[PDB]
Design a protein around this ligand. Structure first.
Ligand code: NTA
Ligand code: OS
Ligand code: OS
Ligand code: OS
Ligand code: OS
Ligand code: OS
Ligand code: 4TI
Length: 649
């Protein structure tokens, strides 16, 4: 058997699950998955049951998704309910802080204001705002209501203990926890702001649109962003307190059975989903409310496999609820993340030389590092421009740029003896790329190529090549050099990976190499002692210009594909100022006055440059870079980018 043991927290849910199980037997063959129904007393008991391998799946609210993640449960979200349109699936809501336009305060100025909450104990209206504000609350913070009552000068916190903490009901006397209170619920908390009772309303992103029809009235309101900035109310995706998943199915991190659960649920919706009008409806409960799933759901989406719980809830949500659960308050040391075995050792030397200012965490992949920076396990790392795009679309920001002397020049290099080649026709040639999705060796060359050919299936534009990161069966892996499972992989164990590796690929197999303007000079004329490069002469290679002509290697300024953005340090926005200081101070002490090659920082970097103007990824990379990368995503799967595109399309 291959059965999904579904968990029920009530006797009505168990009856739903049993009807579920029986109706599935009629639409799924013997080859497919079955339902079994485990009934426990509570969602926590279900979580412990799934972790103890006594059940397989349950669907939880976000707060319980957090509890399911913690040790020793270690559950992960696998399937998400969506709501509204099939064309526009709404999987998350946004907790926001609405304010009146031109009221003159930011998130870090909330103390002493007047607040409107949807209700004590609710997510958007209490748990998230108070969780994020927890360390700003006066001491003692137990009980929590007393601390909030001594933070906001007066509030409307429905369901709060107004007898003991009357400040919490100054704007709705009695703190009535019923719609009899005009300022209760999601509309009421907003009305508390509209009517002028309060200064800020902690609500969901859609309340403002549900209670104000005209946009003219909606331009009188703004949102507080966590960076102490405001934005308009329809920019909640860039100015919220937390992005919360509505209702998501969790499963064991190892031991699945994610594959089975999705197959079961996906076929369940195709047969008993919304508007299928069978005798059994998946999202209906003839007796009860929201049994197994929210009755308002319209279907299920499969959660991308890269996604863990901290990443799916988001950094701000996890921060807020962790503050509520544990209640621990203190630039700190900067946790730099490293990759290879050789790269972590350089960081250790840096850490002891920094005297505590720098610490070191490590991962196996750049994407694993990027993930650790999102959820707080790490703070900063230096990234290729293509990874800055990934990191930016995951909410990270560039802080400093590595300067090598505006940016460097991306070039296309050919062997001069082949005077046949020209930029105007490389169809059916042999290409050598640094890796897939990188600035010099992919995003700039293949971005330009997309405009002439109108697709990103470069496997059938070139004859063959080596572009590490491609699928191992691809023609763009046939010229690669790594052996075993190292063939075509984007790491050091593939000899044609990187700036120099791509050049070596041109020297030994390829017709054209896409690199940076320093590559060919750095590896010719005996400068590179390796046997493959020791006897090469820079004069034997030329650059392909956009003209259609060719020019010598040293004349890259007038024979360049484009100007490339240099590698940059990325971190999350709440650490931008701190990394900006500690690093620029470490740079003034260990700067322009690695053992292997290109460890932690590129080895041709003079200093880490101030940014100011270009402090976001679209501003740093540029309009045409992000536009080109947008086309190239149609043919390239970065599983980390797939997870971040699930939260922020
Ligand atoms: O809790 C119960 O079991 C009672 N039922 C109503 C009934 O069975 O008449 C309420 C309900 O579950 O909606
Ligand atoms: Os009943
Ligand atoms: Os080694
Ligand atoms: Os693979
Ligand atoms: Os592989
Ligand atoms: Os130019
Ligand atoms: Ti690069």
């Amino acid at each position: 058997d291959k059965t999904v043991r579904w968990c029920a927290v009530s006797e009505h849910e168990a009856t739903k699950c049993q009807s579920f199980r029986d109706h599935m037997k009629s639409v799924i063959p013997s080859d497919g998955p079955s339902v079994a129904c485990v009934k426990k007393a509570s969602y926590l008991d279900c979580i412990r049951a799934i972790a103890a391998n006594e059940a397989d799946a349950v669907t939880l609210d976000a707060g319980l998704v957090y509890d399911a993640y913690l040790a020793p449960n270690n559950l992960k979200p696998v399937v998400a309910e969506f709501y509204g349109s099939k064309e526009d699936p709404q999987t998350f809501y946004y907790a926001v802080a609405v304010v009146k336009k031109d009221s003159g305060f930011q998130m870090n100025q909330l103390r002493g204001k007047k607040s409107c909450h949807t209700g004590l104990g609710r997510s958007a209206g209490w748990n998230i705002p108070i969780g994020l504000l927890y360390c700003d609350l006066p001491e003692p913070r137990k009980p929590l209501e007393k601390a909030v009552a001594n933070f906001f000068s007066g509030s409307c916190a429905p369901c709060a203990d107004g007898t003991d903490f009357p400040q919490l009901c100054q704007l709705c006397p009695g703190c009535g926890c019923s719609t009899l209170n005009q300022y209760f619920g999601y509309s009421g908390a907003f009305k508390c702001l509209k009517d002028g009772a309060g200064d800020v309303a902690f609500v969901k992103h859609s309340t403002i649109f549900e209670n104000l029809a005209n946009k003219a009235d909606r331009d009188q309101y703004e949102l507080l962003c966590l960076d102490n900035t405001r934005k308009p109310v329809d920019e909640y995706k860039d100015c919220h307190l937390a992005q919360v998943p509505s209702h998501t199915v969790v499963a064991r991190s190892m031991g699945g059975k994610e594959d089975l659960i999705w197959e079961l649920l996906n076929q369940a919706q195709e047969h008993f989903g919304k508007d299928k009008s069978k005798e059994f409806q998946l999202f209906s409960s003839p007796h009860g409310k929201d049994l197994l799933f929210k009755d308002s759901a319209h279907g299920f989406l499969k959660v991308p496999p890269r996604m863990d719980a901290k990443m799916y809830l988001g950094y701000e949500y996890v921060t807020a609820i962790r503050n509520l659960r544990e209640g621990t308050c203190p630039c700190k040391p900067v946790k730099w993340c490293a990759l290879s075995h050789h790269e972590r050792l350089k960081c250790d030397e840096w850490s002891v030389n920094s005297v505590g200012k720098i610490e070191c965490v490590s991962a196996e992949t750049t994407e694993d590092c990027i993930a650790k920076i999102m959820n707080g396990e790490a703070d900063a790392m230096s990234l290729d421009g293509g990874f800055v795009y990934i990191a930016g679309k995951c909410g990270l920001v560039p802080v400093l740029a590595e300067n090598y002397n505006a940016g460097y020049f991306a070039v296309a290099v050919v062997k001069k003896s082949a005077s046949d080649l020209t930029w105007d026709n490389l169809k059916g040639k042999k290409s050598c790329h640094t890796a897939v999705g990188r600035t010099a060796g992919w995003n700039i060359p293949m971005g330009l190529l997309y405009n002439k050919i109108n697709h990103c299936r470069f496997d059938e534009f070139f004859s063959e090549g080596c572009a590490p990161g491609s699928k191992k069966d691809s023609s763009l892996c046939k010229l690669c050099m790594g052996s075993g499972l190292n063939l075509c992989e984007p790491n050091n164990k593939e000899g044609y990976y990187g700036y120099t590796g791509a050049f070596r690929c041109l020297v030994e197999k390829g017709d054209v190499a896409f690199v940076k303007h320093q590559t060919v000079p750095q590896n010719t004329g005996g400068k590179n002692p390796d046997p493959w490069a020791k006897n090469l002469n820079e004069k034997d290679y030329e650059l392909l210009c956009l003209d259609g002509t060719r020019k010598p290697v040293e004349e890259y300024a007038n024979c360049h594909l484009a100007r490339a953005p240099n590698h940059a340090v990325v971190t999350r926005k709440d650490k931008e100022a701190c990394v900006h200081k500690i690093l620029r101070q470490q740079q003034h002490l260990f700067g322009s006055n690695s053992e292997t090659k290109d460890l932690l920082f590129r080895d041709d970097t003079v200093c880490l440059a101030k940014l100011h103007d270009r402090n976001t990824y679209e501003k740093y990379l540029g309009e045409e870079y992000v536009k080109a990368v947008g086309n190239l995503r149609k043919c390239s799967t970065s599983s980390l980018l797939e997870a971040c595109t699930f939260r922020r399309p």
